[PDB]
Amino acid sequence: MSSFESVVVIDGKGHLLGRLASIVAKQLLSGQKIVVVRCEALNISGEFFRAKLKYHAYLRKMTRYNPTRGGPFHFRAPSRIFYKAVRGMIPHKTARGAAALERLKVFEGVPPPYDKKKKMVVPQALRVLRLQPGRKYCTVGRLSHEVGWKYQDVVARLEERRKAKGAAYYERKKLAARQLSEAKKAAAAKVDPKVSEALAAYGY
Amino acid sequence: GSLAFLPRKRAARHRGRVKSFPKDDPKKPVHLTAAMGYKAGMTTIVRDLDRPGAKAHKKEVVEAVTIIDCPPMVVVGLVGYIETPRG
Amino acid sequence: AKSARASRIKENHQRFKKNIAGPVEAARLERLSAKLMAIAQASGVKSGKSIGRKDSSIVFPM
Amino acid sequence: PSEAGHRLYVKGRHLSYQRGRRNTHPKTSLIKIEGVDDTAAANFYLGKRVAYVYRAQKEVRGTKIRVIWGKITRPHGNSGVVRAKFTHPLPARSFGASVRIMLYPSSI
Amino acid sequence: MRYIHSEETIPVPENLKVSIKSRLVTVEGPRGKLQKDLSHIAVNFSVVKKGVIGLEIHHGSRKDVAALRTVRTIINNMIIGVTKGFKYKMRYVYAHFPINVNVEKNAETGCYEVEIRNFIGEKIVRKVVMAPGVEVEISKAQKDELILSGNSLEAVSQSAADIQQICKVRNKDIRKFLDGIYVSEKGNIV
Amino acid sequence: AEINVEATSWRRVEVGRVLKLENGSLAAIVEIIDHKRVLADGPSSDPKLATPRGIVPLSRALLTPIVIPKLPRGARTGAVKKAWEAYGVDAKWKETNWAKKQLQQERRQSLTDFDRFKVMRLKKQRRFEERKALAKI
Amino acid sequence: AGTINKPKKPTSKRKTTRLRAKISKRAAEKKRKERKLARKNPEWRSKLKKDPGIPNLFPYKERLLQQREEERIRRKEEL
Amino acid sequence: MGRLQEYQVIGRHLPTEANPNPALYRMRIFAPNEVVAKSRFWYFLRGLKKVKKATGEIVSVNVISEKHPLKVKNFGIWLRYDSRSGTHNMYKEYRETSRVAAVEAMYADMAARHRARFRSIHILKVVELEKTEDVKRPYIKQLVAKNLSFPLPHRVPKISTKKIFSAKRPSTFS
RNA sequence: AACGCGACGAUACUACCCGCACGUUGUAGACGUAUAAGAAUAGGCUCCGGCCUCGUAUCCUAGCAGGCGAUUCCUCCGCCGGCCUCGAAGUGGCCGUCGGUAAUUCGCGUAUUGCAAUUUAGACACGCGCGGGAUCAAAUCCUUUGCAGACGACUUAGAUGUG
Structure with a gap:
């Protein structure tokens, strides 16, 4: 509904890379602060050897005299691949583009500051909503691991720990919801019939 | 030369760092990996060689050996590291 | 000549590692760790049992 | 303890000037109003007043907060973005900043 | 052409639990249990009769209904493996150098190991590790033959292929050097 | 031979299935044109649920859990009408959960400013009672 | 081939303007030569062409042929 | 293509002293408007007989529509289309509620499957199949299969395109 | 990475921490900047009754920019402590004191900013002050060394000593 927030956190799982990058870039240039998690869980349409071939051509592309300066720095992390897409989609060689890049943050996995915050999702880039069911797709985590990313296992272990903590949190949440439903029934008896009928007519 | 020892620069530190310890598993006994010493020189020796298959097998060979003064080291601390997505 | 990174050479090295050097280095490490052990053995909040807090950023300031 | 808000305006974001592929026209600005998504929702806000409230270093007559005033003129596109005309074109560094849309003059 | 409907049926015997x-399929029977994910194929599972499982597809293409065929055959293969088992009978032959085959089972990982020695007089020991759940024996019914049985047809056949591929000649004449381990019979345990 | 199967339970497009249109209306399928368009008719006496006979896309449609049992394929407006009041489609639509959600949305949208203030006050009273109940347990 | 592991130099799809023009002038020249050879045309051209006929999958082919026949006889007798 | 309705166009050669009361030809065509109707009428008569727009007049143009456009029909279309190799006959079928809708579908299908254009397609004869037995194509025939009912798997929900961010992951079941 | 990051040591002035007075001090841009399951999408959730197009949902939302007093309420906040918890770039729970508090009703005050004029009000940062606690350091030059060296640079030594 075109809502403005302090910062929107996007769970990158199940998202198509280019479409999520487009939406994120437009939001950054409009003035929204964004934080993207699970870039390793991001998806790319097509087949894995197509993505790997594209990345290997990218690796071919290299400066001749001195790779240390000026050369195309090939980043092997999924967060940095997503950042490369967003940077290519915004004018990074201007102060406004630099400002948008400073409103953008990206991570692998879900850091502990963001594990307790609400993770949003963009329908316009969801794989299950965009891709035809029979088509093939690949994951940026697999691509990064096969092109030289060194921290796939550590991220997997941290995600497993986070999900165990989330399971405990969800047990507590279920207990709280049961208590809330019970109290609402008990209290209903001890509420004025007029308040209830009035609220029902008003739609609450 | 080899393009594997480039950017042919002076060592940033005089001590020299390990840069890689052998990988660790809990099944082995507790032990230390590295140690320190000071190069004193080198000298000549004769070893009765037992290299089955060599022409110097069961023969005396003259070899050059380097000698390292190694006074006992003192433990003064303990550091603990954690694994992160950045290393 | 087989390269040093040949698969068959790697498999032969793996077998040699697993069937000779394994036991030899295991015995060596047992003795060395024995010597190391010889030299070595030669309220929660107010006690330290509960690990509490000692003394750029990842989040955007609000 | 009122513990409530005091907002009488709709939030908005100054996006850019009226522009083509190359040329830009600082006379008219583009405003994305919070919550509006189509031309009818924009038609509700045509004629409403809009203020750009920023801060400077020197206090002139009791404050450091300056304001640039203008009004919504006509809808832009089909996504609810509107055109706004101010007494002075907005500073350009403000591309991504907040604008307050006040409901006066009101016709309801 | 976007066929609206396509349906196929697997009959399940009386003594199995499917x-x-x-899209995870688990079959239990007297021989044991086998589990397989077919999440890569778009298919709707249902029950059409008392002991018949129907797999169905809607608004699909010819490739899709071909995938329906493949799924039906795979599930039936699982059912018949859990009922009657699966058995590959292999033979090792030689001209001058007897081939020595040793079968062992270790407690760790619960797998079988086949050690092959003196193939064409070679000094190398060839180790082949069977997949979990496949049992290999030197059976005393015929000479120079090896029985490789189990519940998963894929595992049984792949183990047989692994042995046959590990014992293959190099830089020799195919028409003159005729020794190796070959799959002689294929069928069911029961 | 026992088979335990739980894959899906879809609602089928079929002659007699009544479907909801974004105007909030209802229409029964009388003929299937293709896998994307059907011929439908809403003869409901309620002007809010009435739909003139015509072609409707299944993308614009949503399948409600109501099916008229045995109305013939290609039945004209009179037959669909008689089937509608014979089966009592309007009462079942009202009892469905979707209609309750739509009614709640309509009430909340038609609710005014003084009504909003009274809603807040009444919710605060009900919430005082709810918090008393929840504190005990 | 090992294209995935080691791709080669890409085949640029960025059209140059020197070639984008050569192809236009060559297309124009080919059209002119086609028209000139069609003018030359040392080969007979007839008036009536081979009508492929009515498809047999048309379910009313019999009725259309019957209408054609009856129209033929009617025209013949009237004229 | 576009919005079409049926047009009958009747036209004749201008009366002369030698040939008064001329032949008064007629045919039915599909056009967005009467202007295109008249233009293609004169085109087809120029192609068939020796009647031109200069020496001819449009006696009548009449909009004919569908008798029963609230009932579902099967239509057989016999047409000619010319590609780089030549002119080809095709018979296809369309399950629609009007002849204009059937011709809409025919032009769309020609464009999609054979890259044919409006001036490359000749519509020879469009018929309403009387009996179901007359359907020759398996797609419409499976649509006319008895007791037809099918589900709608994987329906992506229609989310407003300005709703950039959502809190719940959407479902594709209803 | 000389404009990537971490741990630890010692830090004289300065200001090193705290309380609170603010700043005619900065900000690519507060104004309720409120909202954590995981996982599938040819399935899922549950209180096991049932529910799932739909976040046009939930919480919160009233009072001189939010006064004073009373009837009535044990509800929601907050600060300190205690026990514990959170290490991926480190926080939250329970209990305890103390502080504020329309869930109902009422009285006394709002005026004059004159018919609109950002409703100067948030956060982080930095500075200048007060009164409380704490501490009394290093590097460079210089001489020297040759494990170094075009020159810088580097390895050393120089306070009482195994100099």
Whole structure:
């Protein structure tokens, strides 16, 4: 509904890379602060050897005299691949583009500051909503691991720990919801019939 | 030369760092990996060689050996590291 | 000549590692760790049992 | 303890000037109003007043907060973005900043 | 051409339990249990009769209904493996150098190991590790033959292929050097 | 031979299935044109649920859990009408959960400013009672 | 081939303007030569062409042929 | 293509002293408007007989529509289309509620499957199949299969395109 | 990475921490900047009754920019402590004191900013002050060394000593 927030956190799982990058870039240039998690869980349409071939051509592309300066720095992390897409989609060689890049943050996995915050999702880039069911797709985590990313296992272990903590949190949440439903029934008896009928007519 | 020892620069530190310890598993006994010493020189020796298959097998060979003064080291601390997505 | 990174050479090295050097280095490490052990053995909040807090950023300031 | 808000305006974001592929026209600005998504929702806000409230270093007559005033003129596109005309074109560094849309003059 | 409907049926014997989750299929029977995910194929599972499982597809293409055929055959293969088992009978032959085959089972990982020695007089020991759940024996019914049985047809056949591929000649004459381990018979345990 | 199967339970497009249109209306399928368009008719006496006979896309449609049992394929407006009041489609639509959600949305949208203030006050009273109940347990 | 592991130099799809023009002038020249050879045309051209006929999958082919026949006889007798 | 309705166009050669009361030809065509109707009428008569727009007049143009456009029909279309190799006959079928809708579908299908254009397609004869037995194509025939009912798997929900961010992951079941 | 990051040591002035007075001090841009399951999408959730197009949902939302007093309420906040918890770039729970508090009703005050004029009000940062606690350091030059060296640079030594 075109809502403005302090910062929107996007769970990158199940998202198509280019479409999520487009939406994120437009939001950054409009003035929204964004934080993207699970870039390793991001998806790319097509087949894995197509993505790997594209990345290997990218690796071919290299400066001749001195790779240390000026050369195309090939980043092997999924967060940095997503950042490369967003940077290519915004004018990074201007102060406004630099400002948008400073409103953008990206991570692998879900850091502990963001594990307790609400993770949003963009329908316009969801794989299950965009891709035809029979088509093939690949994951940026697999691509990064096969092109030289060194921290796939550590991220997997941290995600497993986070999900165990989330399971405990969800047990507590279920207990709280049961208590809330019970109290609402008990209290209903001890509420004025007029308040209830009035609220029902008003739609609450 | 080899393009594997480039950017042919002076060592940033005089001590020299390990840069890689052998990988660790809990099944082995507790032990230390590295140690320190000071190069004193080198000298000549004769070893009765037992290299089955060599022409110097069961023969005396003259070899050059380097000698390292190694006074006992003192433990003064303990550091603990954690694994992160950045290393 | 087989390269040093040949698969068959790697498999032969793996077998040699697993069937000779394994036991030899295991015995060596047992003795060395024995010597190391010889030299070595030669309220929660107010006690330290509960690990509490000692003394750029990842989040955007609000 | 009122513990409530005091907002009488709709939030908005100054996006850019009226522009083509190359040329830009600082006379008219583009405003994305919070919550509006189509031309009818924009038609509700045509004629409403809009203020750009920023801060400077020197206090002139009791404050450091300056304001640039203008009004919504006509809808832009089909996504609810509107055109706004101010007494002075907005500073350009403000591309991504907040604008307050006040409901006066009101016709309801 | 976007056929509206296509349906196929697997009959389940009276003595099996076929528990299918979203697209996970688990079959229990007297021989044991086998589990397989077919989440890569778009298919709707249902029950059409008392002992018949129907797999169905809607608004699909010819490739899709071909995938329906493949799924039916795979599930039937699982059912018949859990009922009657699966058995590959292999033979090792030689001209001058007897081939020595040793079968062992270790407690760790619960797998079988086949050690092959003196193939064409070679000094190398060839180790082949069977997949979990496949049992290999030197059976005393015929000479120079090896029985490789189990519940998963894929595992049984792949183990047989692994042995046959590990014992293959190099830089010799195919028409003159005729020794190796070959799959002689294929069928069911029961 | 026991088979435990739980894959899906869809609602089928079929002659007699009544479907909801974004105007909030209802229409029964009388003929299937293709896998994307059907011929439908809403003869409901309620002006809010009435739909003129015509072609409707299944993308614009949503399948409600109501099916008229045995109305013939290609039945004209009179037959669909008689089937509608014979089966009592309007009462079942009202009892469905979707209609309750739509009614709640309509009430909340038609609710005014003084009504909003009274809603807040009444919710605060009901919430005082709810918090008393929840504190005990 | 090992294209995935080691791709080669890409085949640029960025059209140059020197070639984008050569192809236009060559297309124009080919059209002119086609028209000139069609003018030359040392080969007979007839008036009536081979009508492929009515498809047999048309379910009313019999009725259309019957209408054609009856129209033929009617025209013949009237004229 | 576009919005079409049926047009009958009757036209004749201008009366002369030698040939008064001329032949008064007629045919039915599909056009967005009467202007295109008249233009293609004169085109087809120029192609067939020796009647031109200069020496001819449009006696009548009449909009004919569908008798029963609230009932579902099967239509057989016999047409000619010319590609780089030549002119080809095709018979296809369309399950629609009007002849204009059937011709809409025919032009769309020609464009999609054979890259044919409006001036490359000749519509020879469009018929309403009387009996179901007359359907020759398996797609419409499976649509006319008895007791037809099918589900709608994987329906992506229609989310407003300005709703950039959502809190719940959407479902594709209803 | 000389404009990537971490741990630890010692830090004289300065200001090193705290309380609170603010700043005619900065900000690519507060104004309720409120909202954590995981996982599938040819399935899922549950209180096991049932529910799932739909976040046009939930919480919160009233009072001189939010006064004073009373009837009535044990509800929601907050600060300190205690026990514990959170290490991926480190926080939250329970209990305890103390502080504020329309869930109902009422009285006394709002005026004059004159018919609109950002409703100067948030956060982080930095500075200048007060009164409380704490501490009394290093590097460079210089001489020297040759494990170094075009020159810088580097390895050393120089306070009482195994100099």
